[PDB]
Amino acid sequence: AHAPKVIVFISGSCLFGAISRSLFKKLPIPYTVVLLILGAILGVVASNVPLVEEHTRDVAHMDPHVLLQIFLPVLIFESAFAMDVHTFMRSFSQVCILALFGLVVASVLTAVLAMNLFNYNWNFSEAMMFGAIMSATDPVAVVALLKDLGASKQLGTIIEGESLLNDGCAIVIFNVFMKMVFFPQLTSTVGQNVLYFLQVAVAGPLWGYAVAKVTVFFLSHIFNDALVEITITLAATYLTYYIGDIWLEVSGVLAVVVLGLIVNAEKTSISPEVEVFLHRFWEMLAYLANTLIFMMVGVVVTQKALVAVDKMDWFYLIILYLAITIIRGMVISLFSPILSRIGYGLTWRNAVIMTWGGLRGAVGLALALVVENLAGNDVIGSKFLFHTAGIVVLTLVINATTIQTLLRILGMSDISIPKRLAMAGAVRRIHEGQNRTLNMLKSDRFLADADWDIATAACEISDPYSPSPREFADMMEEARLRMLKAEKISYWKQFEHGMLAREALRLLVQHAEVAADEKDQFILVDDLKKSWQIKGIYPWLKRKLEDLISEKKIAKLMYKICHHMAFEVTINIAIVLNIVPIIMEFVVQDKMALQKIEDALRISNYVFFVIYAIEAIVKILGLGRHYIVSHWNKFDAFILVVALVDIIIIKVVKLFRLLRGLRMLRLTKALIPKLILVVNGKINNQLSLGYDVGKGYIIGEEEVGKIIDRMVDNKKILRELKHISETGRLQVVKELGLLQREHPGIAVSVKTRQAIRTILNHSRETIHELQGAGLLDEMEAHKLELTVEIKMKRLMNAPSSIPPPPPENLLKNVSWLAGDMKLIDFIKARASLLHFDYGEVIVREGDESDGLFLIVSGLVKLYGKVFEDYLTVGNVIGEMGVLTKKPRNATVTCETTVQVYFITAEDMNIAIDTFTLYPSLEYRLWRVVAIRIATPLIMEQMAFQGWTQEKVKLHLERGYLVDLAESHFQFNIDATLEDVILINGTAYNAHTREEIRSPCLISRTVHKLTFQYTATEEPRLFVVRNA
Ligand SMILES: Nc1nc2c(ncn2[C@@H]2O[C@@H]3COP(=O)(O)O[C@H]3[C@H]2O)c(=O)[nH]1
């Protein structure tokens, strides 16, 4: 008889939920309504059949607190965890104005209604509870509908976020007014109310934020332990509510709301495979919670609530339903002028959807169950549940069912022409693909006898949506609209390969859409700047905090110990330990208002004072008279002044603050660096986004500029577009380069994070390629792919700021120098560093090439015959003037203060002729040039296919230069030779004796290349072999 009878009810409710969700899958009525009917049926039979009553009693009569403690954390957290937080923040003010202030008016008006209309003679407190529970909305259905039909970019999240905040605040108001109705306290002190307000409203979010930032800290330090990650998430979610609500008397719901939002924002710290599990897991838990609440409501509403329902109650139900409907619309319209100025605004049709889509749900019902249990035999409990359930039913029966048609009437359900065209094209391409497979299968000997009628009928994919200037402007608009489409595609292809973060993709696509809507409007670079524009607050904080710990002024073993890190670390650790005595002794004294402990801990304070005294002794003997120079030491001398002056002695009570203050304050020296790190983190986030948007736009323009050549007919239009794109690209590449100069360390951090991530991604691909070809066992491959996963998670713990390498390091890591230590020594011992001021010219067109240059600082603009570009740290200039002894091809101007490593041409010839091993210096230098020339050519040839610039760069990377001497002629293999690029010199076609210009992609029709040994120019050829 000790079996947990709650098991059958919980499991049975799951089966009934499955049945309802299955049968009413295509019908309009939401399944939750069916669950309520089933619960009512269970209730009526339970009144007659005692056996079932014994199986429903333990859940139907659930204690009220346990209801809140278990279900609300799931419902609230799941709602928060499922939000599109980025869009939520971009409209946070718009949500808050409507969610918080709108809630107050909506509930109070409802409370006034409930006091005046209803004959229950409720007072204001009960009426406010009524209004609070009536203002909680669960639009899960409406947001789901909008996600498919469109306008989900803003509206779906506004209603979802508004519902989240409204539910969060409703529980707060309900918690406040419940205590004044069922647990009244007479004290009613005016001052305490302010304190009480701060705890529920202000402390809650802070508690949630603290727990969230602790949680994500550990989650980022867990590798390959998915179970631990999931368990940590669960325990953090449940302890946040429990500790906050019970131990701290702090608003649990708000703490969980912040915790859910913060964790959702920090999803990168969760392993990708655990993230997808958690989303489905929390969804499942919320689904279970919803079903239980509806079934419980159905059971109890029939058992003890409908027994005491009068005729007028039904009348008031309809009136109340109408009132809450008009009240929501009035509130939305009343704030409409404000919402127009703050955020995205509200169109009249969008407002109607918000007004009509305000469905009530479980959160409202759960609170009603609490009143029913708490009210006991009072009619308040029954009529609270009656109206809550009734309004829930009506909103589910009417609002939830007609919203689909209303969205059509307002014309919001219409699918745009581009979507229809894309879907039709996709369906047709899939349809064609199946036909190709069908022909292939019919030729198979094994499968030749299959029933093809059934196969074709059962695998069909169906479309679910089924020269005059006056004339000249039409051509312009078509090109503009078509180019904007190519840009949108270009961003998407980048996202698939991981070159672009999702936020940058969304920003770029949104900007493209905004441009398309307006007439004669292209994507505005001056509008893109809002991404990589670092607001001054964070740089100011960084500089100010760095100033506070500028130890440059401070800059026989006592001196050595004074400057050893272990000394400071140990003493700071002692001080943080010394917090415990400080709290303990004074807490004991407060409790005392025995003395044995007090006397004992006063001695320990002397011990800690002695520790600090020996610290000071070491510091002074290390630095001598110059110890007092630093303000920090002055404070640490003042603390020991207090020690000496007050160790001897309101004589007792005055000592606590003196002991506390200085000791607890002198920890800030160890805190300031952490705040510097945090501020770097904030700058690192914004800067990282800036590079993505800027880099994405630059690559998008570069790619599209070679697709628009074939797409637009009118030449004058072609010139027009290629000019705007060039201006925008130069603007971005210049502005983006400057950010590096402003924040060198953070820029290096960002650039290293991308570099590693790109390496690991392609490292992951080869494993799949090896596994895909079967060359590696599945278990062995999975073992390797784990190491990649942990490495990519260690990436997100990398320091936000990395000190930039000194110039000597740059020489080591150059492509055509890395690896050969002897060569690096030769160059490093001959390269001379130079400095330049703003606007100074390093080189000029036609001027004789004197020596190479490597940029170690600053930014330089290039102007050559017209092509213009900007180059920055790490780039090399002067390579094609040394490799071929020819005048310079471009002018170089220093857009800012610049430093360069100058290697004289005379050195290069010596370096070239000295290092002649297989990885020849001249070979590598030419290879670097060749890839830079080849990429534009191959991109131009192959841009109209699915080839992104990264792939072409990788494709060329596999190539190599041909010696061209041991084989004076190059013969064009097709099987193992994919493409051939000429980089220098000229070649003669054997079958035509035609000459081909130096920078050209050898056409496939050429079968053999014949070369010459004239000393004027050594021809150079680049070849990339096939798989
Ligand atoms: N013209 C041109 N020069 C480049 C480019 N990238 C780097 N450079 C350097 O600009 C230098 C100017 O002409 P040089 O012959 O001195 O050698 C050139 C290259 O080393 C580029 O993309 N185009």
Query: Is 764 a member of any domain?
Result: no
Select from 360, 386, 409 the last residue of a domain.
Answer: 409
Ligand 1: centre distance to CA 887 (Å): 11
Whether the CB-CB separation of 1020 and 967 falls below 8 Å is answered with no
Binding site, by residue number, is 2, 878-881, 888-889
Ligand 1: centre distance to CA 889 (Å): 6
**Residue having the nearest C-alpha atom to atom 18 of ligand 1:** 878
CATH number at residue 888: 2.60.120.10
Select from 618, 642, 670 the last residue of a domain.
Answer: 670
Residues 6+ apart with CB under 8 A from 947: 938, 939
Q: How far apart are CA 447 and CA 442, in angstroms?
A: 7
Ligand 1: centre distance to CA 848 (Å): 14
Query: Is 53 a member of any domain?
Result: yes
Residues 212 and 261 in one domain: yes
Q: Is 532 helix (H, G, I), strand (E, B) or coil?
A: coil
**Residue having the nearest C-alpha atom to atom 4 of ligand 1:** 877
Whether the CB-CB separation of 855 and 810 falls below 8 Å is answered with no
**Residue having the nearest C-alpha atom to atom 5 of ligand 1:** 877
Q: How far apart are CA 835 and CA 832, in angstroms?
A: 10
**Residue having the nearest C-alpha atom to atom 7 of ligand 1:** 877
Residues 208 and 337 in one domain: yes
Residues 76 and 102 in one domain: yes
Pocket test for ligand 1, best of 889, 926, 929 (most atoms within 8 A of CB): 889
Residues 891 and 1000 in one domain: no
Q: Residue for token digits 């991109």?
A: 939
Ligand 1: centre distance to CA 877 (Å): 6
Ligand 1: centre distance to CA 958 (Å): 23
Whether the CB-CB separation of 258 and 212 falls below 8 Å is answered with yes
CATH number at residue 604: 1.20.120
Query: Is 933 a member of any domain?
Result: yes
Ligand 1: centre distance to CA 851 (Å): 13
| Beta carbons within 10 angstroms of residue 207's beta carbon | 23
Tell me how far the alpha carbon of residue 916 is from its chain's centroid: 50
Residues 830 and 969 in one domain: no
Residues 70 and 47 in one domain: yes
Q: For residue 875, give the ligand 1 atom closest to its CA.
A: 7
Whether the CB-CB separation of 96 and 141 falls below 8 Å is answered with no
Select from 647, 670, 693 the last residue of a domain.
Answer: 670
| Beta carbons within 10 angstroms of residue 25's beta carbon | 8
**Residue having the nearest C-alpha atom to atom 16 of ligand 1:** 878
Query: Is 962 a member of any domain?
Result: yes
Query: Is 697 a member of any domain?
Result: no
Method: cryo-EM
**Residue having the nearest C-alpha atom to atom 10 of ligand 1:** 877
Residues 307 and 193 in one domain: yes
Query: Is 688 a member of any domain?
Result: no
**Residue having the nearest C-alpha atom to atom 8 of ligand 1:** 877
Q: How far apart are CA 362 and CA 291, in angstroms?
A: 9
Q: Residue 255: in which H helix or E strand, if any?
A: helix 252-265
| Beta carbons within 10 angstroms of residue 440's beta carbon | 10
Q: DSSP string spanning 396-429?
A: IIIIHHHHHHHHHHTT-SPPPHHHHHHHHHHHHH
Domain residues for the domain of 614 are 547-670
Q: Is 349 helix (H, G, I), strand (E, B) or coil?
A: helix
Binding site for 3',5'-cyclic AMP, by residue number, is 878, 880-881, 888-889
Structural gaps in the chain: residues followed by a C–N separation over 2.5 Å: 466, 555, 593, 649, 865
C-alpha distances (whole Å) from 269 to each of 80, 223, 236, 623, 687 are 17, 10, 15, 44, 19
Query: Is 783 a member of any domain?
Result: no
Binding site for 3',5'-cyclic GMP, by residue number, is 878-880, 888-889
C-alpha distances (whole Å) from 55 to each of 13, 47, 187, 718 are 12, 12, 43, 78
Residues 1008 and 903 in one domain: no
Residues 6+ apart with CB under 8 A from 98: 162, 331, 332, 335, 339
Query: Is 717 a member of any domain?
Result: no
Instruction: Provide the domain count of the chain.
Output: 5
Residues 49 and 108 in one domain: yes
Based on its alpha-carbon atoms, the radius of gyration of the chain, rounded to whole angstroms, reads 37
Q: How far apart are CA 42 and CA 172, in angstroms?
A: 33
The phi-psi region of residue 878 (left if phi > 0; otherwise alpha if psi is between -120 and 50; otherwise beta) is: left
- State the resolution, in angstroms: 3.3
Going by the DSSP 8-state scheme, the letter that residue 972 receives in this structure is -
Residues 393 and 436 in one domain: no
**Residue having the nearest C-alpha atom to atom 13 of ligand 1:** 889
Residues with CB under 6 A from ligand 1: 849, 864, 877-881, 888-890, 932
CATH number at residue 324: 1.20.1530.20
Ligand 1: centre distance to CA 746 (Å): 28
Pocket test for ligand 1, best of 880, 928, 983 (most atoms within 8 A of CB): 880
Ligand 1: centre distance to CA 934 (Å): 14
Residues 77 and 103 in one domain: yes
Residues 901 and 939 in one domain: no
